[PDB]
Amino acid sequence: STGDVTLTKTDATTKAALAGAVYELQDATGKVLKMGLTTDTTGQLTVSGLTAGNYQFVETKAPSGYQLNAAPLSFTIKPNQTAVVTVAATDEPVT
Amino acid sequence: STGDVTLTKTDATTKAALAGAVYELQDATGKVLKMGLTTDTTGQLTVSGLTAGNYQFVETKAPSGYQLNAAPLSFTIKPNQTAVVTVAATDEPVT
Amino acid sequence: STGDVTLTKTDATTKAALAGAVYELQDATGKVLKMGLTTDTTGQLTVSGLTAGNYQFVETKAPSGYQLNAAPLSFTIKPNQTAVVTVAATDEPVT
Amino acid sequence: STGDVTLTKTDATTKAALAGAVYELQDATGKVLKMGLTTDTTGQLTVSGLTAGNYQFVETKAPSGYQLNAAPLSFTIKPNQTAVVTVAATDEPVT
Amino acid sequence: STGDVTLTKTDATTKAALAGAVYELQDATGKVLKMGLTTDTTGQLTVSGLTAGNYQFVETKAPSGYQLNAAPLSFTIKPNQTAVVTVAATDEPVT
Amino acid sequence: STGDVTLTKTDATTKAALAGAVYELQDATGKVLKMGLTTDTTGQLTVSGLTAGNYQFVETKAPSGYQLNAAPLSFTIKPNQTAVVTVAATDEPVT
Amino acid sequence: STGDVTLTKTDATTKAALAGAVYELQDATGKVLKMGLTTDTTGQLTVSGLTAGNYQFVETKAPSGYQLNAAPLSFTIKPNQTAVVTVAATDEPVT
Amino acid sequence: STGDVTLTKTDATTKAALAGAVYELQDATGKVLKMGLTTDTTGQLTVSGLTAGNYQFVETKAPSGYQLNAAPLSFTIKPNQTAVVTVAATDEPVT
Amino acid sequence: STGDVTLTKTDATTKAALAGAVYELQDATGKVLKMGLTTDTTGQLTVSGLTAGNYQFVETKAPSGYQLNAAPLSFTIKPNQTAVVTVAATDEPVT
Amino acid sequence: STGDVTLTKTDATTKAALAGAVYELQDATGKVLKMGLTTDTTGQLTVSGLTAGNYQFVETKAPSGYQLNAAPLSFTIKPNQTAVVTVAATDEPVT
Amino acid sequence: STGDVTLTKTDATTKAALAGAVYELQDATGKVLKMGLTTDTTGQLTVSGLTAGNYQFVETKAPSGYQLNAAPLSFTIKPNQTAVVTVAATDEPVT
Amino acid sequence: STGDVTLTKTDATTKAALAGAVYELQDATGKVLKMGLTTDTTGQLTVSGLTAGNYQFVETKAPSGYQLNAAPLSFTIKPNQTAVVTVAATDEPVT
Amino acid sequence: STGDVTLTKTDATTKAALAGAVYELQDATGKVLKMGLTTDTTGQLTVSGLTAGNYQFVETKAPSGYQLNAAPLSFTIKPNQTAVVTVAATDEPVT
Amino acid sequence: STGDVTLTKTDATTKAALAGAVYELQDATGKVLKMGLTTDTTGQLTVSGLTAGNYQFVETKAPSGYQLNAAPLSFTIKPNQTAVVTVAATDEPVT
Amino acid sequence: STGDVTLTKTDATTKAALAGAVYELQDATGKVLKMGLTTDTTGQLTVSGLTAGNYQFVETKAPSGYQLNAAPLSFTIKPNQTAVVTVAATDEPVT
Amino acid sequence: STGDVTLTKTDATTKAALAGAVYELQDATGKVLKMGLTTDTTGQLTVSGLTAGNYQFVETKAPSGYQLNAAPLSFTIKPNQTAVVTVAATDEPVT
Amino acid sequence: STGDVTLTKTDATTKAALAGAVYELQDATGKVLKMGLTTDTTGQLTVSGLTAGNYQFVETKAPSGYQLNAAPLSFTIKPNQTAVVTVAATDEPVT
Amino acid sequence: STGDVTLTKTDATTKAALAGAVYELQDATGKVLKMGLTTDTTGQLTVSGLTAGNYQFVETKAPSGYQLNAAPLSFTIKPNQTAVVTVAATDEPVT
Amino acid sequence: STGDVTLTKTDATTKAALAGAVYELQDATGKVLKMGLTTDTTGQLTVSGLTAGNYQFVETKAPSGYQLNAAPLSFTIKPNQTAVVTVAATDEPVT
Amino acid sequence: STGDVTLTKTDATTKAALAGAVYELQDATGKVLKMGLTTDTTGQLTVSGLTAGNYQFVETKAPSGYQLNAAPLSFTIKPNQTAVVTVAATDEPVTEP
């Protein structure tokens, strides 16, 4: 089958959702598979229909007022996955 | 708060709208954030939900019969912006 | 056979769309054919069903806070036009 | 109490309808009351809600390929008019 | 290819539409092809789907209060006709 | 103004409605204005939008099993008519 | 099986339909079976679902301006009737 | 040309509407034209499409618990009546 | 408070429903309150909204091929009736 | 429990409905509770949702052409009222 | 070809419809073919799609307040029958 | 016949519409016929269905921030009125 | 009892359907009963509601580019017809 | 800028909502601005579109079975109000 | 931001709305910006989406029967206007 | 789970479907579980939602013109059955 | 591109449409491409989406009562064919 | 007339429906008229609109796991068939 | 049966509705039955379907900016209660 | 259980979809089971509800302008298959010598 992943983006200090954070989806080697994935006003983005494997999200643009953190957020889609994989990303306000 | 941008693409000599021009969206450093953005039959493409910041469009494929010009088309999304940012791009016919 | 034209109006400094700019449509000799054409909140106005010929838009009232610039914006409707002709006008903020 | 008027525009040699002819509505003294009235693909334009009075249509732009004829086409809206007034204008090909 | 024709009927002295005028459609030799074509309250009748050829309308009953004028109103449907042919007939009031 | 007329067609001996009776509509001088007017399963046909004047129906084909009777059935549309004119025609069975 | 009957009512001198004429439906012995049957603006009334038999309509109130004529209007509903029975009644204007 | 009449029926002592009162419509000579007209839960019945004339309602069955009063309730439908005629009947409780 | 009554009509020998039987509704003294009540193809007719009282149905025309039997069919509407009163009438075939 | 009241207004000499009569609703002591209640083209006005009690309507403007009669029209809403109370008011034509 | 049957159930003393009476459908030998058939609030039940033959209804539970009477109610479905067979059943109140 | 009236309410110094202005409608003698009539966000209130006569509006509460001006605003509903009567009221800001 | 006929028109050399062929419908003696019957873009025209009898189609205008051929195409409508009657007509290209 | 108020009416002893309580709305000086405002079956009445100011509700008729209490229930509509203002009124049962 | 303006037009002597009055919209220097603005049957015309500024309406054709008065009717659209601006124009009947 | 069964009934000699055959559903011991199951015009009946087990159909009334054959038609519903079980029954015409 | 073909099947004697005639579609060498193509109650069958080429229909079963005629009915689908190709097939009645 | 036929396919040992069995339809001499008829998940296939005649089904591919049995299954479509013809085919599981 | 209760929460100083106040429902001994009941933007919460009994609301969290007051608000649901029970709750602003 | 199959047909030179190519469905021995299966404007035809087995498509008419190639295109429907089987056919453009 295929499976789905949801990322939720927040302000690290208030835990409030952030719209407009931009991510790449990479495979576990770092190869960019999708780009321009952007959080909505609930702080969420979802990618559906991923084949099983090891992936990572990498932030490419932080929301205005926040520091970019390009550290990969790893996740695995399992074979015959029956529930969404759902990862939490946070952003520090700029100094 | 996020903002939107519309690009309108024409034939430089006739000012007629061109479909099928392909663009990247970069940040102001040239980092590619989105790719494959393609004009419709009114010559327009729109990107919605951008966080505030400085951006630029770069043509990656000209419509058939036209010369590619990859010079960046700059624009800024302002915080709390209340109106769409629009930009006009043109293409020289092959000759 | 007729063709359509769209004008898009912006703030020259921000590239943001401006509503409420008023234009005349003139022929190429300056004869006024239509008046009171007013941009909407995307900064656009469209005139449809024009016969082929040489025309020009002339601003008759700038949006509040902008300088009037009545210089003509030329365009041609061609006899077998298959796409809208689509022109970009800008406005300088006052002072 | 108001009345309506329709103008139909043709090629004088083929009697075929012409789109894109542009007209002024004047009162019988020549004062311009409306401008930019444009014929559609059935050759027609209509003005509704006119008060009783003496009026005339004046061509301001002929369809491409046709000669301009600015001779006024007179008509009267009568006080309790129950039928549309409906006038025929023609255009000679150029040369 | 077939084409369409519209006839518009008025009172010659007021230019107002007349309903209830009845017409034959004849070929150019005078052979009657259709009969009983009657104008509506906008003064119009329309025949669609005519093959290319030379035709003429002939009035067979004038609206009540008007003089019958059976003089043929000629028109031509051309091959691959793109626009309706649209003719204007008038009626003089009796005595 | 125009008026309407309805014709109702029966078997003379049973008073039952007959479908498929065919009529001409003529002016009072006998000139054919419409033809092929055919009664429905309630025995009725209606012509609407007639100008005021003197008219007559003439049967051109009787329903199968009935004798043709071409005697004119006279009627008048009055100016500013406010009710349908509604005439009754009968057919004798063949003997 | 049952059958239907329609009565149409006119002014004898103009053949125009009359509304508001009132009728009884009787059997052929004169026994009243229904009363108050009133013509509409097309001069019509209809009775549906009658068993086979011999019947007659008898006017009980003529429309205003017209003379009452109570002579029975006979008709028969036949056992396997396939078409509506339709009868024509007329009224003379008062002197 | 026809008019409408409404009758409203009440308990004379409480002015409350009564359902189920039964009435004849007669002409002004007493001839019965309609019977069985029955009031609804708002106390009302309506007869529409009456020709101009002099009429009267006669109670034929009072609501249970009420005394029958067959005194005629007169009304007139006028030739070009523009408003409903609307009459009030009352009923006395028994004892 | 009012009540409803349904009459069902059959062929006495087959118990099959009969359409087109005509009935009067009388009060218990024999006064006719409604006439022309006609059974449908399920052999039924219903009178609704009757005030409480003693009533009777009287056949006024039997369906074609059946013998008339005018003997009254009594029923009572009760003051706080909560169900339809529902009576069965039969008809004998002729000869 | 609340109840409803309907007033019906007529011309006393023709029994025709009058629109535009204006009424106050007062309690039985004369205290005004509602004002401006105006009859419609059926001559009616309705107040719903009244608590049980003793009330009266008082006319405050008679229809044009009619004499004002401010005499109170009394009515009572009873507890657990099951039927609308429905009163009849008349107006004499002036002079 | 199949046919339908309706049973209508009343209180013998009031002729009011009874809901909730329960019936078996037997063939004419008394063999039970269907059971549990229950009257609705109009006192009716219908069995559709019966092959031609001789049948009988037998009450198996009387409505509450009524005596059970299991005497068969006979009926026949005829081949090609065109009308519903109806039967009337009654119930004696307990006393 | 009845007529309608519309009142439009502005700030005297800006001509901008005011909501929430409250008015009485009085007859020409000052008798209050309706009260509590309140302007909407377009500054308008409409009363429909008035009988012909002489009336006046009297402000009873000015919009917050404005001075109350109780001077009557007179108007007339004419018989067979064909257009709304439409009056303009203004309010001075508090100083 | 009436019947329908469908005529299908083609180019004799290609068997492709032709639009705009014009036909008269005559009875078997040549008397014209309908005229102006025109084929559509599937080459079809249908006449419905014909009484039983013998008829013939006679071309009165061939499609542009084809030769007129007025030879009759005969057909019979039978009583109680259950299937549409069909005829095929061809047209030779002009030489 | 206007605001809304909701009044909720109850039986003081049970706290159950009461329908049919009638209120005036006054300004803070007691001037009557609206009358006839009646509570519904949830005990509620709402007035919307009030301009800012101080008001009071004054009962003018208590629900049947309750004592009238005309003491004012005061409230303030503030400028730029964002929430409905609410008041609770109670009614004592009569003794 | 933009704002709207509505003009209402009346007969000065009756305060009745007038249709068919024609206006120009000018800037406050008198430059014509729109023409042909025509009042509807409520006497209204509306212009929407104007930028902030000073404007004036100038009548160009009075309704039939009324005197032209070309005096400018001034108004201002303010920068953050929240309500429609509404102006009242009147017309004197001809002598 | 549960499973479904369909029985199809035919005339043994023509293989045509028979409506109106009546069946019992029994368990494999002969205990009657359902009765009155009747074939429709496609000769079919279906029972859904049967628990797994051994069952049999037994005909209780053959269609009119056919011989009853009460021989059981056995079938099994299996656990986790994934397709309908679907049995064929035939009927011999009577001698 | 592709094209479509419609076959129409008749009784050769009556020209009545026949349902149920069965055809193969073959190429012009006789190779079978489709089989089982069956005419409907308008006597028609259509094959859509055929590539250009030379084809033939061959009857494989005539309707009951008609003789089989397997003679090929040729037709050609042309490249960029714009109209349906039709063919007329016929059947001799059996004797 | 035409008729329909349904075939139902089962596993001979379980009587369960089988999907995916493929059949030819032949006439009774073995000539193949249709091929590829495939059973659905209820085990059924249906051919409609067959003309009267003698036919047979022949299995061309058994469902996976079952033995092919090409023995013809005969059936006849009669003239004026009123019911679907329904045949039962079975399959033996492979050993 | 059951009954419903609605609580309305205000700011005690302004009487403005407050959202977000949180309540327990307890029986009259203090036992907690429901918790987390939260007022909406009309200041309301409703509990439906309560059995008869004595209850109390207890505030567990006041809206931000207000002081908690945990005093119980008693109410009783009566057997066969017919109207909603309401209670008014209020909150002191913080200082 | 049954399975579906889709065939897509192209011009071999341009890879454009071709409408109007006609196919037979055969079993793996060559027995014709269905005929007349015609590609649509996206070049596709689909057969659904096939029992598990070994099958083959055989072109019977190539689109106009192309050469017929009746070489069988083999495919297998598996028991309980869960995805459509989807085969690609192509056609050489012609010209007569």
Added chain:
Amino acid sequence: STGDVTLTKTDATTKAALAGAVYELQDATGKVLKMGLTTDTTGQLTVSGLTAGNYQFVETKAPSGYQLNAAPLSFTIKPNQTAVVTVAATDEPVT
């Protein structure tokens, strides 16, 4: 002109469609124009709106269980494309 392309992805050994294969779209020189294009459960992906040119798909992630093969799959979008371009890609199972 723009054109469309469809890619279909299978398992090379079974020819079964594969979901979740991911592709780049590159121009003919290898320049990446779009990325992240993923096949669905029919094995397909489609890109629309491509300008004329030469492109290639390159696999970036194979479905789980399959070997990545990044060899380009080339295609041409022609000007004025009238048919979709299709390409077939296969994947080998991992060893």
